[PDB]
Amino acid sequence: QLSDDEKLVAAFVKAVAYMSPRKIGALVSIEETQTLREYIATGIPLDADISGELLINIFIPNTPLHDGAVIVEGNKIAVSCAYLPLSESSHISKEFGTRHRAAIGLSEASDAFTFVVSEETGAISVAYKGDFIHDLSLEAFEVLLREHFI
Amino acid sequence: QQLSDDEKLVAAFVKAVAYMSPRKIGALVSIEETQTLREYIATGIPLDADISGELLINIFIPNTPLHDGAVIVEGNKIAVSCAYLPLSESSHISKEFGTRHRAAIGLSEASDAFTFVVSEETGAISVAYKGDFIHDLSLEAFEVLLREHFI
Numbered sequence: 687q688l689s690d691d692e693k694l695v696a697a698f699v700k701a702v703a704y705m706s707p708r709k710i711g712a713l714v715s716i717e718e719t720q721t722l723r724e725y726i727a728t729g730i731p732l733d734a735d736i737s738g739e740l741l742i743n744i745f746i747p748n749t750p751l752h753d754g755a756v757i758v759e760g761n762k763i764a765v766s767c768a769y770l771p772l773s774e775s776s777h778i779s780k781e782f783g784t785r786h787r788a789a790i791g792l793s794e795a796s797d798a799f800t801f802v803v804s805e806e807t808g809a810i811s812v813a814y815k816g817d818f819i820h821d822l823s824l825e826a827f828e829v830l831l832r833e834h835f836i
Numbered sequence: 837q838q839l840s841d842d843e844k845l846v847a848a849f850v851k852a853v854a855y856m857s858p859r860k861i862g863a864l865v866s867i868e869e870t871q872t873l874r875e876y877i878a879t880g881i882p883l884d885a886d887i888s889g890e891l892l893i894n895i896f897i898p899n900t901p902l903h904d905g906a907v908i909v910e911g912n913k914i915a916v917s918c919a920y921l922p923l924s925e926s927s928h929i930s931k932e933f934g935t936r937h938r939a940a941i942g943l944s945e946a947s948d949a950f951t952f953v954v955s956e957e958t959g960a961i962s963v964a965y966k967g968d969f970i971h972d973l974s975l976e977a978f979e980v981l982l983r984e985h986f987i
């Protein structure tokens with residue numbers, strides 16, 4: 687449980703360390719106090735143990751599980767391919783695509799913690815409670831996850 | 837009345853090989869029957885995942901972290917990927933058949949598990965069960981065998 691939180695952080699760090707330098711797009715949302723049941727209902731059920739390796743395999747481009755969001759519930763990957771509400775806010779830079787607007791939209795509609803890897807640039811970003819943090823370093827991503835989840 | 841576990845299993849396997857065979861994506865999938873596969877499951881990466889054709893496909897995409905080794909199904913879950921199975925020590929195995937096939941055949945000597953393979957060389961779908969090896973099944977043949985065995 688404390689060790690489960692450290693495995694969660696390590697899984698996310700391994701996945702983003704693989705995907706970011708390969709510019710593999712990724713979108714991962716973690717449930718907090720507000721249920722994500724309605725978005726989980728839109729995805730393919732996995733109910734899978736969390737590991738960096740499984741997160742990488744999910745997001746490999748042009749594969750059946752890659753398109754849409756992974757939603758983490760507790761210590762399980764609940765689903766992949768979930769459809770998240772887009773943000774209609776105009777303050778979103780033009781260069782930020784669908785994945786980023788999906789993450790931002792969920793962070794305006796829930797207290798879920800979402801991170802993105804850009805398929806255009808490999809930039810790592812976080813969307814949480816209406817704040818959007820662009821282009822984190824891997825070390826910064828890790829310490830932010832640790833502070834939030836450990 | 838929703839689709840039974842057995843119907844979902846058959847559909848998952850059929851969808852997966854239907855995708856991997858034409859693409860010549862190698863695959864190795866073993867299903868536990870009455871004899872526990874616990875010692876082989878211990879060698880794999882824990883997934884404990886719901887069975888879907890989509891997940892099986894994503895596991896075996898070439899040059900990915902989960903694609904090497906065997907997937908082992910236990911009950912209605914994908915227990916592990918990347919598992920090690922016993923390689924067949926037999927010498928009456930054609931030189932056409934590589935290590936995935938020898939692993940499938942080996943496990944079918946050591947247990948009553950049902951294993952199927954997709955060849956990365958030809959895309960051929962094959963089954964290894966109770967020491968017998970059935971090469972190059974059609975998709976229809978594969979499905980009917982799965983139904984006769986699992987339903």
Ligand SMILES: Nc1ncnc2c1ncn2[C@@H]1O[C@H](COP(=O)(O)O)[C@@H](O)[C@H]1O
Nearest residue numbers: 904905906919920921923934935936939
């Ligand atoms: N003992 C084994 N059990 C399960 N899979 C294996 C085993 N040995 C090799 N493989 C896999 O068989 C495939 C072909 O092996 P190779 O011909 O050595 O490239 C690769 O995915 C290997 O990881």
Ligand SMILES: [Cl-]
Nearest residue numbers: 804809810811
């Ligand atoms: Cl980003």
Ligand SMILES: [Cl-]
Nearest residue numbers: 821822823826
């Ligand atoms: Cl930073």
